[PDB]
Amino acid sequence: TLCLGAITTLFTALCAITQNDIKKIVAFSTSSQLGLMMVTIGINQPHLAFLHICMHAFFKAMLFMCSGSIIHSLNDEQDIRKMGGLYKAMPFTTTALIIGSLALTGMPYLTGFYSKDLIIEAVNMSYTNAWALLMTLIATSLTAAYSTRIIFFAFLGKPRFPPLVLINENNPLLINSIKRLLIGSIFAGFIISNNIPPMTVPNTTMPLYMKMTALIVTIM
Amino acid sequence: RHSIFAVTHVLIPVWIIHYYLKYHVTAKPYTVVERKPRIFPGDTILETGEVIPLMKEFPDQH
Amino acid sequence: AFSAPAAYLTHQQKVLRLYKRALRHLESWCVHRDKYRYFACLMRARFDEHKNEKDMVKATQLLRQAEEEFWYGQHPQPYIFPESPGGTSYERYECYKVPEWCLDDWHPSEKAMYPDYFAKREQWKRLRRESWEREVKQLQEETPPGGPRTEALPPARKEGDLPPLWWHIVTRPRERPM
Amino acid sequence: MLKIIIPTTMLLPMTWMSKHNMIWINATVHSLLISLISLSLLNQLGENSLNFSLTFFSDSLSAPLLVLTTWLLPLMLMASQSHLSKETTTRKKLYITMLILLQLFLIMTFTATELILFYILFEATLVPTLIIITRWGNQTERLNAGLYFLFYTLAGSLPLLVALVYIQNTTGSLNFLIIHYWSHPLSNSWSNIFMWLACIMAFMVKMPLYGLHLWLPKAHVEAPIAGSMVLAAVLLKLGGYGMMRITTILNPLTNYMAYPFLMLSMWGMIMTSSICLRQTDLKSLIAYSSVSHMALVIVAIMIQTPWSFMGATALMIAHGLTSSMLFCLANTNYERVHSRTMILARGLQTLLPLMATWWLVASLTNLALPPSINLIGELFIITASFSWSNITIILMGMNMMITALYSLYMLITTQRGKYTHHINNIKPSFTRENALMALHILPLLLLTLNPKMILGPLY
Amino acid sequence: SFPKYKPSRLATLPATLDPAEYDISPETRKAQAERLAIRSRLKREYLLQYNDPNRLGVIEDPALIRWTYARSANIYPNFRPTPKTSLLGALFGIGPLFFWYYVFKTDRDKKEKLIQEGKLDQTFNISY
Amino acid sequence: GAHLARRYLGDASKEPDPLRMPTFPPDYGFPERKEREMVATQQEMNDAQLMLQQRDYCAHYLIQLLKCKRDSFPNFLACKHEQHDWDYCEHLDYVKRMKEFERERRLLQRKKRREQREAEMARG
Amino acid sequence: PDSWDKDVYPEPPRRTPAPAPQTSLPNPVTYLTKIFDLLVDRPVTLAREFIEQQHAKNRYYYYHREFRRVPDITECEEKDILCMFEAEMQWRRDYKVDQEIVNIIQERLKACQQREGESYRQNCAKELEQFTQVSKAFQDRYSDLGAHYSARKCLAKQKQRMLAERKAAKEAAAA
Amino acid sequence: VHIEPRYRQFPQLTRSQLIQAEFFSATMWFWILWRFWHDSDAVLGHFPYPDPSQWTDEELGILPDDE
Amino acid sequence: SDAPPLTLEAIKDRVLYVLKLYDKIDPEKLSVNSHFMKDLGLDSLDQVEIIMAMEDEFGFEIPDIDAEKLMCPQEIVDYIADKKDVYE
Amino acid sequence: GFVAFMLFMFWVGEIYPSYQPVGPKQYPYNDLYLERGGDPTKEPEPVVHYEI
Amino acid sequence: MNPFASLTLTTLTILTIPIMMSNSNIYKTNLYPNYVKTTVSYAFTLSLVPLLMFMHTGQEMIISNWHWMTLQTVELSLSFKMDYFSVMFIPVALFVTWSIMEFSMWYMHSD
Ligand SMILES: CCCCCCCCCCCCCCCCC[C@@H](O)O[C@H](CO[C@H](O)CCCCCCCCCCCCCCC)COP(=O)(O)OCC[N+](C)(C)C
Ligand SMILES: CCCCCCCC/C=C\CCCCCCCC(=O)O[C@H](COC(=O)CCCCCCC/C=C/CCCCCCCC)COP(=O)(O)OCCN
Numbered sequence A: 001t002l003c004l005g006a007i008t009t010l011f012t013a014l015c016a017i018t019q020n021d022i023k024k025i026v027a028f029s030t031s032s033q034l035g036l037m038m039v040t041i042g043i044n045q046p047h048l049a050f051l052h053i054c055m056h057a058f059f060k061a062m063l064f065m066c067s068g069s070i071i072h073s074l075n076d077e078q079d080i081r082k083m084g085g086l087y088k089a090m091p092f093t094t095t096a097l098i099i100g101s102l103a104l105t106g107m108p109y110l111t112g113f114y115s116k117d118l119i120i121e122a123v124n125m126s127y128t129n130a131w132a133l134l135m136t137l138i139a140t141s142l143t144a145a146y147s148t149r150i151i152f153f154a155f156l157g158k159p160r161f162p163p164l165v166l167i168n169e170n171n172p173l174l175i176n177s178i179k180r181l182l183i184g185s186i187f188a189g190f191i192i193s194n195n196i197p198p199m200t201v202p203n204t205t206m207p208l209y210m211k212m213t214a215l216i217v218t219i220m
Numbered sequence B: 001r002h003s004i005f006a007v008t009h010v011l012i013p014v015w016i017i018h019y020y021l022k023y024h025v026t027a028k029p030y031t032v033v034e035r036k037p038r039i040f041p042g043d044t045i046l047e048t049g050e051v052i053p054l055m056k057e058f059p060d061q062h
Numbered sequence C: 001a002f003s004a005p006a007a008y009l010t011h012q013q014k015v016l017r018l019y020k021r022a023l024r025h026l027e028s029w030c031v032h033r034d035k036y037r038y039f040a041c042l043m044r045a046r047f048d049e050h051k052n053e054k055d056m057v058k059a060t061q062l063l064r065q066a067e068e069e070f071w072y073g074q075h076p077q078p079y080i081f082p083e084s085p086g087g088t089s090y091e092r093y094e095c096y097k098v099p100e101w102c103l104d105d106w107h108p109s110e111k112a113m114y115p116d117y118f119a120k121r122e123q124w125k126r127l128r129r130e131s132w133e134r135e136v137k138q139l140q141e142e143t144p145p146g147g148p149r150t151e152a153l154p155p156a157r158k159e160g161d162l163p164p165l166w167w168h169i170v171t172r173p174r175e176r177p178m
Numbered sequence D: 001m002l003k004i005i006i007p008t009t010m011l012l013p014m015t016w017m018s019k020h021n022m023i024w025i026n027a028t029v030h031s032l033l034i035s036l037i038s039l040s041l042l043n044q045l046g047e048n049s050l051n052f053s054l055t056f057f058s059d060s061l062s063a064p065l066l067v068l069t070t071w072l073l074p075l076m077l078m079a080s081q082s083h084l085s086k087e088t089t090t091r092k093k094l095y096i097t098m099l100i101l102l103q104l105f106l107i108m109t110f111t112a113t114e115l116i117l118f119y120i121l122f123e124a125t126l127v128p129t130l131i132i133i134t135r136w137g138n139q140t141e142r143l144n145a146g147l148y149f150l151f152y153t154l155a156g157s158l159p160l161l162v163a164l165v166y167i168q169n170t171t172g173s174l175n176f177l178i179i180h181y182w183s184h185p186l187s188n189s190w191s192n193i194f195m196w197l198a199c200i201m202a203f204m205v206k207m208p209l210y211g212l213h214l215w216l217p218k219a220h221v222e223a224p225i226a227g228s229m230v231l232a233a234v235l236l237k238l239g240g241y242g243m244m245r246i247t248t249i250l251n252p253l254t255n256y257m258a259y260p261f262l263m264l265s266m267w268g269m270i271m272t273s274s275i276c277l278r279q280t281d282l283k284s285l286i287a288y289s290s291v292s293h294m295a296l297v298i299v300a301i302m303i304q305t306p307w308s309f310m311g312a313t314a315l316m317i318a319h320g321l322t323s324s325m326l327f328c329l330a331n332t333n334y335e336r337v338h339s340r341t342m343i344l345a346r347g348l349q350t351l352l353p354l355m356a357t358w359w360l361v362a363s364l365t366n367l368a369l370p371p372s373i374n375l376i377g378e379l380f381i382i383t384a385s386f387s388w389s390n391i392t393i394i395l396m397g398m399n400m401m402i403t404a405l406y407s408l409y410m411l412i413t414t415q416r417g418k419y420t421h422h423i424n425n426i427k428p429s430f431t432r433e434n435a436l437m438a439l440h441i442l443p444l445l446l447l448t449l450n451p452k453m454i455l456g457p458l459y
Numbered sequence E: 001s002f003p004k005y006k007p008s009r010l011a012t013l014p015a016t017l018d019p020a021e022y023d024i025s026p027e028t029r030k031a032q033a034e035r036l037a038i039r040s041r042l043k044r045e046y047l048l049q050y051n052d053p054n055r056l057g058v059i060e061d062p063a064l065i066r067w068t069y070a071r072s073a074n075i076y077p078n079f080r081p082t083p084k085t086s087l088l089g090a091l092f093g094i095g096p097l098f099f100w101y102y103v104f105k106t107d108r109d110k111k112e113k114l115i116q117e118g119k120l121d122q123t124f125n126i127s128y
Numbered sequence F: 001g002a003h004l005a006r007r008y009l010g011d012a013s014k015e016p017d018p019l020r021m022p023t024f025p026p027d028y029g030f031p032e033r034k035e036r037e038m039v040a041t042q043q044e045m046n047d048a049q050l051m052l053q054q055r056d057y058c059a060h061y062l063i064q065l066l067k068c069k070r071d072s073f074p075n076f077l078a079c080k081h082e083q084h085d086w087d088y089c090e091h092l093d094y095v096k097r098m099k100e101f102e103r104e105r106r107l108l109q110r111k112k113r114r115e116q117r118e119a120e121m122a123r124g
Numbered sequence G: 001p002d003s004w005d006k007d008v009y010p011e012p013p014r015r016t017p018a019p020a021p022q023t024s025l026p027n028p029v030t031y032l033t034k035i036f037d038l039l040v041d042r043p044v045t046l047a048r049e050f051i052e053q054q055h056a057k058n059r060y061y062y063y064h065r066e067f068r069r070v071p072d073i074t075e076c077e078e079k080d081i082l083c084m085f086e087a088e089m090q091w092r093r094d095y096k097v098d099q100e101i102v103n104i105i106q107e108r109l110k111a112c113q114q115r116e117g118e119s120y121r122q123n124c125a126k127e128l129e130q131f132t133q134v135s136k137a138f139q140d141r142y143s144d145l146g147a148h149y150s151a152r153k154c155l156a157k158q159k160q161r162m163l164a165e166r167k168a169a170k171e172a173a174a175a
Numbered sequence H: 001v002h003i004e005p006r007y008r009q010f011p012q013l014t015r016s017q018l019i020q021a022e023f024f025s026a027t028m029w030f031w032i033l034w035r036f037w038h039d040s041d042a043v044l045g046h047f048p049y050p051d052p053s054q055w056t057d058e059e060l061g062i063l064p065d066d067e
Numbered sequence I: 001s002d003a004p005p006l007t008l009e010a011i012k013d014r015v016l017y018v019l020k021l022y023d024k025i026d027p028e029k030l031s032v033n034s035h036f037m038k039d040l041g042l043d044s045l046d047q048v049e050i051i052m053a054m055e056d057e058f059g060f061e062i063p064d065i066d067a068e069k070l071m072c073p074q075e076i077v078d079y080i081a082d083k084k085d086v087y088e
Numbered sequence J: 001g002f003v004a005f006m007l008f009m010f011w012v013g014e015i016y017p018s019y020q021p022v023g024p025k026q027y028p029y030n031d032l033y034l035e036r037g038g039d040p041t042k043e044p045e046p047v048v049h050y051e052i
Numbered sequence K: 001m002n003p004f005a006s007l008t009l010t011t012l013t014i015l016t017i018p019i020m021m022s023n024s025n026i027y028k029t030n031l032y033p034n035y036v037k038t039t040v041s042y043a044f045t046l047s048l049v050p051l052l053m054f055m056h057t058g059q060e061m062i063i064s065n066w067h068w069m070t071l072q073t074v075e076l077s078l079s080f081k082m083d084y085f086s087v088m089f090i091p092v093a094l095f096v097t098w099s100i101m102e103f104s105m106w107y108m109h110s111d
């Protein structure tokens, strides 16, 4: 299970960083996160895997709805090469996708942190396959890589869409659904983490560089 | 007609299910099984009035 | 799609189609507009360099290495318009396209709604019925004895004729039928 | 048991003395009433069977089959009256008479206490089916189909007859109760091997076993709709039922005489499922799917376990219902366009939405979606086979995959895509066709609520 | 100049890389003209029935009829017992049967002689 | 870590085996070893239903943490001192395991030195 | 309730702790429980009281059928069809009752595993042992009988097992 | 809220979407800063990692190589 | 909702808008009926680029066999109107 | 090549695993002998742990 | 009786009511998507309560309500596990489904 999860997460993250359809990138992200769930099953941490399921649901669903709002605004266009500068044109969508990408990459004290941070620490501090651990760390870096790709190509720079601009995100249904899952992606990690009994022995003692490894590989 | 949705889609279904569980499902053994509650030192048992003693005087490494 | 294909493509047509494909794949490679404009001007210059070549053997071999270079350097994931054959919305609305003859099978209660629409539909059916034989006669007259050579069709030529074989072109369902 | 037989016999003078425009109504109403009456045989005992008399008895194996037969007659009548409209009054009455005689023979076959009576009715079912296929089939191949349907059966059943009389010379009786109570082991001898083969090969041909199955695609494709419905839903099961009765005298010989048939069934199940992937004729695909399901039933009967017998009973009933529904679904489109080529009429979900829903539900039951009784039977058989040998899962699982692959394939080919442009005579679905589909599908779903009623004696 | 693309069965040669489309002779042009003429005659034959107001039903396609007939009924009359067909039939029809027979018989012989020795761990195995 | 480099690239015979340790007697180098004591009885852990992997020498702190969480249920931010105490006890247990690892590797290196050097002085 | 026998389906005395609040914050579980009581349990209880009042006015009984003990297959002659028939019916009933005995023991095991939580491996040892004993006896009685099992086949299986045990004991007395 | 296309111009924006986007970005940043001010150890670890080399032989039970 | 229904005037205005931003075309003598070859003095490469610019303008691409023979702005407007089911 | 390389490297990583420089985790009551299946009638071999 | 079991089963049961109404008049109206979304939101709100009960006392349950069939010694019953995983995942899934249905009311408006 550990080896299958490791090869899955790294292969899918490697495929994600060159894709041009936004839905395809987010789907490969989902596959990579499922691979991470499988590796945390393989190191005998089932409760941590379930916690990751619950955490990842929020921000992955929010990321898909942000992609859907972009697609609907740009007349059903899904290629990031034809999405220009939407940072100012779609401000709420930009905010939501930024927060979702930060949660996906394990930014501290967000929903993805309380899950992903622990999984990386547990893999680092276990009697585990060395290749699997290396592949997991590389996949962790590739996650930030393809999140950067989405943000940079879809929201930064100059417009690359057809001249008839139909951009409109001022619908209460879209705004309210995104807002609800955004509050989820911000606070559900803390709430659920502090409101459940401890099902695991915590890793309280580890070298400092190993403590900071997930953030370091994300920064890279 | 303001809250007609919550009385026909919530209150009525929970009336039928609670009646079904309380008087039919639990009329047979082992149909609804709960894990026993956790008991900690110092607790008082409601059923018999028994008191569990405390836990062996920690070394108190403060 | 609307034009009848010919037996073969001329050298000029092949060269133009290669130009269009190369420019589109270059745009796929060069995401940004200014960079694409620069490299598209370079492509146009490199393409014009041999515009006035006379030896057709040399032009043909130049076209061959141009095709080889395109195949080696094409974008593996080129941009496709959403409703183009490889696009994400290619045949999306085909399930909503219903042929017009289905309207003949509606219950009389269904046709009681929309009376004016069905009056105009009867008018259209009368037109088609009255024009069919003249269309067939015109097609028989204008076709060489050795059968048709291409798929091109003639227009109407008399005062009150309709172009032959027009019904199914004119009564297309729609591009966004629902 | 005569309370079922005599009304069925009375169906004959009723249809022969009815008004020219009343034959279908009378036959349908009274066959439905007979099915309602037969529904009372489902009250079974456990310990032993319902022994009405010296001649007829009912078991937990016989009763679901009897109910399925009596229920299938009205559906066949409903499906037949469309394409038989132009027929004369006398020939319509003769067609209904063939159907009634077939039901009578099947009802007596499923309840006969004595093996020679069972054999005689088992052969008697041949004649009405042959007449139906060769007189009311549409194409010129029907005649050849009839021959294939006949001599495959007889070439298997003639040895069985010999074995049967031989048995009565040594045992003294062919009454099934006596046979079961006084059963003795078969020794390991050449004479016993050939008596085993004579006792088994007729039911093998009827299943049909892979390699003896060539008659089935011909006969089911060339037959009219009621013929195909009865051939797939009930007649094939005549093999299975027969095996479940006769294996009680074949132990412990079956312990090793069953290896070639098990290998044939598993491999040919894979083979026929794969054949379904490349089939241009829509009825042929359904026929080959029937062959694959019956191969699984053969495996279940040959391994001789309570779980396998239960699974075989459930799968027989479920497949009868599902295959009859699929044949009716294909016949609706055939009557639309007068061709059985699967790719001729496409995108039919756009033009016939409710019939598309019927197609979808039939395809779901064909691939054994839980908790349908199709999967109940299939899973029981697979678990018993796994106990027989753990490697069987490799083949069984493979079959499952291929089954889904062709089922949805059929669904995708006829219902999805775009409609064929030049086909402009696709009229809305009639109430008769929708009602026929519903009367196929609803009992199948209701059987999920009470599965034991089809799980057989071993429950 | 650039690495060469070589075709395969499941990844065919593109038209633009096909030399046959660049070495053109008058007979090639006349053959293309004949192909276009055949296509056009068939197209006119189809469109005269497709647009007919009085046509109701299915336009029967002889090509589809020929395809289904060749795939089903024309096969046995054109079959000839050949060493190639004989070996292929023997292999693909009989080899899997003995292969699976050997596999299952070996597995069951192991399991049975292991039951005889009293070492199989059959505890809690009461359903079968 | 560097221990993996020493075991895999250097001489593995001088490095501890995580699967097979300790090999030296627990009282070998120590004159007097006090046996590790447990506070929580078997019944207390069974009634708390902790987990079979949470029933270590730190279980009493976990029991108080669970009781405090249950007692102040609405206020999920109140069990900080108990969580800290349990974490500290687990940290001390981990430090003890690190001490055992270091002790066993030092013992094994000292064993190799003494054995092969008494051989060296015994071969001449 | 008293509908079932507590000896056949036992359960431990069900100790539950008393609530020991440690905070001044209101407990939402208790408030929601009171709301649920008042809006769900009281109307359901009243409806059940009405239904039981109606049932009391119409009280009738049904009985459990008792079967005599008939001779078993051991003392039936070789070709006596009637004694064989009655012995076979009795054997079928005994087989059904044994199946339901195994079912009761399995129900005990499942309920124990759920009830004990994280301590099921140690606290359900008695149920596991009871299921092991019952399962072994059932496997000895009825396994490998096949599709067409009968009292005669069970008798033959028992005789084969008895012969094996006798030979084992005889050769153990020689060692 | 009726918004019209603009043909090669920046689209018309509403005040509500801008204020909500800014509010939620600020909420995320404040939450991160607040949690780091109160729960810094969750990133930085709370207990010091020991150095095994700073442990004497007496407390680990190693004899001075002559026994 | 979605984009407003397209009109013939809008299609013509956008086609002329794109053509007037092309440097090889005089903005003031350009008409809806101007032949690209005879009147404007362009070549086939310029026609290919004009077709591509129109495809970018309207977010859909024209097949080469159809695109080869759009030799004036009115022809492009008519082609777009027929493709997108515009009648007014 | 990618798949074969991944399989070979996973096998190598199995041969040369990663772990932390710690001893085994210790459990109080004879390594929880009664908790892990019991059998309380056979006097299990005492597992004793000492301070370090 | 304990409200835990009744609430856990009701949360699941009320999700099936619009499937029963799919043949009613509301299905032919434009109010059906809003009705489905409201049903899912009410189900999420109801499922929030067993989660609170579990977070308070760690309550877990199994409910074997309907006996389907008995296969000699194997009893098959409709049984639901209401442990930590179920009572934690159900509200999360319902919350996500509620947001996604509200989003679909706008995304698929012209379908
Ligand atoms: C298209 C599909 C049609 C249906 C197929 C039906 C399959 C039926 C096959 C029957 C399976 C087994 C039959 C008999 C069992 C054993 C057969 C024999 O091969 O085994 C050996 C038998 O020894 C020799 O091999 C003798 C048999 C060889 C002669 C028979 C010719 C076989 C050639 C294949 C002919 C094709 C048959 C099918 C025609 C269509 C075992 O040796 P031994 O244990 O000492 O003797 C056992 C018999 N005793 C106890 C009575 C003494
Ligand atoms: C769709 C095609 C199906 C073809 C089926 C053909 C196989 C049928 C099985 C054999 C048929 C005849 C068997 C006779 C019935 C058995 C009754 C019996 O027990 O008689 C045997 C006698 O058995 C025989 O004589 C049978 C020998 C075979 C005679 C005919 C040969 C035909 C070809 C043989 C092989 C084909 C059979 C299997 C084919 C499988 C299906 C393809 C013993 O009687 P006694 O003489 O008293 O001896 C007692 C002391 N030992």
Ligand SMILES: CCCCCCCCCCCC(=O)SCCNC(=O)CCNC(=O)[C@H](O)C(C)(C)COP(=O)(O)O
Residues within 6 Å of the ligand: C011, C012, C013, C015, C016, C022, C025, C026, C029, C046, C047, C050, C051, C052, C053, C059, C062, C063, C066, C067, C069, C070, C071, C073, C074, C075, I043, I044, I045
């Ligand atoms: C970016 C990814 C892949 C890119 C790689 C592509 C490589 C291509 C490099 C350069 C291509 C060439 O040299 S192309 C070499 C082709 N040679 C000739 O065409 C000579 C004869 N000229 C004519 O036929 C006409 O002038 C015509 C030019 C058709 C215009 O005609 P109009 O005026 O009537 O439109």
